[PDB]
């Protein structure tokens, strides 16, 4: 385990997350316009897939915001990392989430895997790849939900479509079966 | 000589190939353009252009 | 053309800021070079005077 | 089985289907004009063959729309593909149809065969070319009908001719034998 390596990788992860969330917000605007165009036509069951894409990306942006927050938290309390040998309570959440989410966002942010390494190679109490996955039952549940790979609720998709239609001056008749239940 | 070398079968096949190749090129162009645009999105914000 | 104009504006601002940064760095490096020449000359003078 | 290969091939299939349905709509307009010209003359039994061509192409365009929908659905729930080892219910229809229709539209869309490969090489429960054809009894029946290679109903052909004639200001006397039965 190297400390300065972890510091540099944390700063890089922060910058990368900033860039990614910016450009993802922009792409989300453009793809929302695309969904509005799709709704202009009679194609409806396809706009639901497109808006699934959109809300997945939005969950992802929120999760990246949370991860940037946690990385900056670790970077603000880095000396408290170097001094102690076991992490305190103030850093349990950050370390846990940054180790749990690394394989999730490993493709988007590469440096995150190095951060996970330095945070797994520094600890031995329930640590190590195997024990690091075993002791991952203390991560932020909200971030787990944002990065949860699951079909979003249908009513949520209908609400997303209703709002986009209402904004882009396009008519849309929600599926009452899901819109009312 | 020519119509023996370049007959109707070969010409039709060659033209189907031309059409399919340039359709594939149409797909490549679309994807390439999507990516080119996605690369430069912070220099050209949609809001500013609007 | 609006996309092109906005892009050119933003990239011109970026190039200007970037050139300012490189100008600062180059001024610092030029100061360092001149001071290194001065320090070398004064070391030689110190040796000769010693 | 490679995941990113499947992702890229799905995106390519989507783009190809878009291009194909566009140009097929255009060609359908032009060939409808041709059928109108054919009906202008006394040639009637030939316009029926031409309109058979047309309605085959229209079935094909609708099937391509459905397939684009399903490919985008898989692409929106790709993580749910990578995580599990057996497909869930939400992806049964997409996978089944994309494996069943691949040999049908293999000539039009080449990448579709690669998609079918990645979706057959990933599963073993009733999977593999032989078992993949054996377990194909759960595909969308509508898409099966759109890609069904069968002589369309004669009354449907008469309705197609009636509409085209009525639109292009050409007289046409439908075959009463089929027009009434």
Curated annotation (Swiss-Prot), chains A, D:
Residue numbers spanned by region Interaction with CHMP1A and CHMP1B: 1-163
Modified residues (Phosphotyrosine): 38
Superkingdom of the source species: Eukaryota
Location of this chain's protein in the cell: Cytoplasmic vesicle; Cytoplasm, Cytoskeleton, Microtubule organizing center, Centrosome; Midbody; Nucleus envelope
Assembly behavior: Interacts with CHMP1A, CHMP1B, VPS4A and VTA1. Interacts with SPAST, STAMBP, and USP8. May interact with VPS37B. May associate with the ESCRT-I complex. Interacts with MITD1, in competition with VSP4. Interacts with SPART (via MIT domain); leading to the recruitment of SPART to midbodies. Interacts with SPAST.
Family: Belongs to the IST1 family.
Function: ESCRT-III-like protein involved in cytokinesis, nuclear envelope reassembly and endosomal tubulation. Is required for efficient abscission during cytokinesis. Involved in recruiting VPS4A and/or VPS4B to the midbody of dividing cells. During late anaphase, involved in nuclear envelope reassembly and mitotic spindle disassembly together with the ESCRT-III complex: IST1 acts by mediating the recruitment of SPAST to the nuclear membrane, leading to microtubule severing. Recruited to the reforming nuclear envelope (NE) during anaphase by LEMD2.
Protein's UniProt name: IST1 homolog
Curated annotation (Swiss-Prot), chain C:
Localisation: Cytoplasm, Cytosol; Endosome; Late endosome membrane
Superkingdom: Eukaryota
An MF annotation (GO) of this entry: MIT domain binding
Record bears the keyword Transport: yes
Record keywords: Cell cycle, Cell division, Coiled coil, Cytoplasm, Endosome, Membrane, Protein transport, Transport
GO biological process, one term: multivesicular body sorting pathway
Gene Ontology cellular component annotations, sorted alphabetically: amphisome membrane; autophagosome membrane; cytosol; endosome membrane; ESCRT III complex; extracellular exosome; kinetochore; kinetochore microtubule
Tissue and organ distribution: Widely expressed. Expressed in pancreas, kidney, skeletal muscle, liver, lung, placenta and brain.
Family: Belongs to the SNF7 family.
Subunit record text: Probable peripherally associated component of the endosomal sorting required for transport complex III (ESCRT-III). ESCRT-III components are thought to multimerize to form a flat lattice on the perimeter membrane of the endosome. Several assembly forms of ESCRT-III may exist that interact and act sequentially. Interacts with CHMP1A. Interacts with VTA1; the interaction probably involves the open conformation of CHMP1B. Interacts with CHMP2A. Interacts with VPS4A; the interaction is direct. Interacts with VPS4B; the interaction is direct.
Function (record text): Probable peripherally associated component of the endosomal sorting required for transport complex III (ESCRT-III) which is involved in multivesicular bodies (MVBs) formation and sorting of endosomal cargo proteins into MVBs. MVBs contain intraluminal vesicles (ILVs) that are generated by invagination and scission from the limiting membrane of the endosome and mostly are delivered to lysosomes enabling degradation of membrane proteins, such as stimulated growth factor receptors, lysosomal enzymes and lipids.
Protein name per its UniProtKB record: Charged multivesicular body protein 1b
């Amino acid at each position: 385990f190297k400390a300065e390596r972890l510091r540099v990788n944390l700063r890089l992860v922060i910058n990368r997350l900033k860039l990614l969330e910016k450009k993802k917000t922009e792409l989300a605007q453009k793809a929302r316009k695309e969904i509005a165009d799709y709704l202009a036509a009679g194609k409806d069951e396809r706009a639901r897939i497109r808006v699934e894409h959109i809300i997945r990306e939005d969950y992802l942006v929120e999760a990246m915001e949370i991860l940037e927050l946690y990385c900056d938290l670790l970077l603000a309390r880095f000396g408290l990392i170097q001094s102690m040998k076991e992490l305190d309570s103030g850093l349990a959440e950050s370390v846990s989430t940054l180790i749990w989410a690394a394989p999730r966002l490993q493709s988007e942010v590469a440096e995150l895997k190095i951060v996970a390494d330095q945070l797994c190679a520094k600890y031995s109490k329930e640590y190590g790849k195997l024990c690091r996955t075993n002791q991952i039952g203390t991560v932020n549940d909200r971030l787990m939900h944002k990065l949860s790979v699951e079909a979003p609720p249908k009513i949520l998709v209908e609400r997303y479509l209703i709002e986009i239609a209402k904004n882009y001056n396009v008519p849309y008749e929600p599926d009452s079966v899901v819109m009312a239940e | 000589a020519t119509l023996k070398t370049m007959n109707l079968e070969k010409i039709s096949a060659l033209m189907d190939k031309f059409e399919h190749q340039f359709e594939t090129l149409d797909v490549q162009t679309q994807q390439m353009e999507d990516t080119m645009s996605s690369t430069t999105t912070l220099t050209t914000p949609q809001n500013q252009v609007d | 053309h609006a996309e092109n104009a906005i892009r050119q504006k933003n990239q011109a601002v970026n190039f200007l800021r970037m050139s300012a940064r490189v100008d600062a760095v180059a001024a610092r490096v030029q100061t360092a070079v001149t001071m290194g020449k001065v320090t070398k000359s004064m070391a030689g003078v110190v040796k000769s005077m010693d």
